[PDB]
Amino acid sequence: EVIKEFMRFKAHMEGSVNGHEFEIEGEGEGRPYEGTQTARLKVTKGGPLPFAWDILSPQISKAYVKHPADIPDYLKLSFPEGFKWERVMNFEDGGVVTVTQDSSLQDGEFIYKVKVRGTNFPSDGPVMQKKTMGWEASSERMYPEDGALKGEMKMRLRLKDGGHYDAEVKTTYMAKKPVQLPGAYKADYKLDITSHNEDYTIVEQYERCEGR
What we know:
Number of strands: 12
Order of helices and strands: EEEHEEEEEEEEE
Structural class: mainly beta
Organism: Discosoma sp. LW-2004
Pfam family, one: GFP
Shape: globular
Family: Belongs to the GFP family.
Strand order of the largest sheet: 1-2-3-12-11-8-9-10-4-5-6
Keywords: Chromophore, Luminescence, Photoprotein
Protein name: Fluorescent protein plum
């Protein structure tokens, strides 16, 4: 049908973190029913970034989440029109990241438009000093509320110096048509940076996500 067993995507991201503006463009591919995907991203403006790429990686794809048959796959069902999402991440040291995203399907490939704002990150923190080392696996609590599918999760970022750096995350995912919302369930994620040049202006990532 509209969602094939293999799908490519194009992504464009604009934003600002602690006042630093940037643009990122990327292309990816994956297997939406198996919950797996990879992408190649390039910082096209504002590179090299003065902050950890790790805060941007989750803002680059929910059409690729493996679901059981008895769970309506609301975000897949939303296509060809698609869906929008709005996210707020509250980090333990007061940093905040907010995101608004549009997902659409244009002639057989997914199109992602992302806007990112980060603010209040301590200048001496792991984000502005780039001391981060990738996200631990996460479980997102999914639940229907107010005509939308909501997600909530605590995410933990590994630090290069030893510890962990935590965020509280809340996201609203909204189909462009009112397709069948699921009941409550959990989506488990693993997101890895698989390749990156010295300054991270070219980065590759891989993610597996499965609803339980």
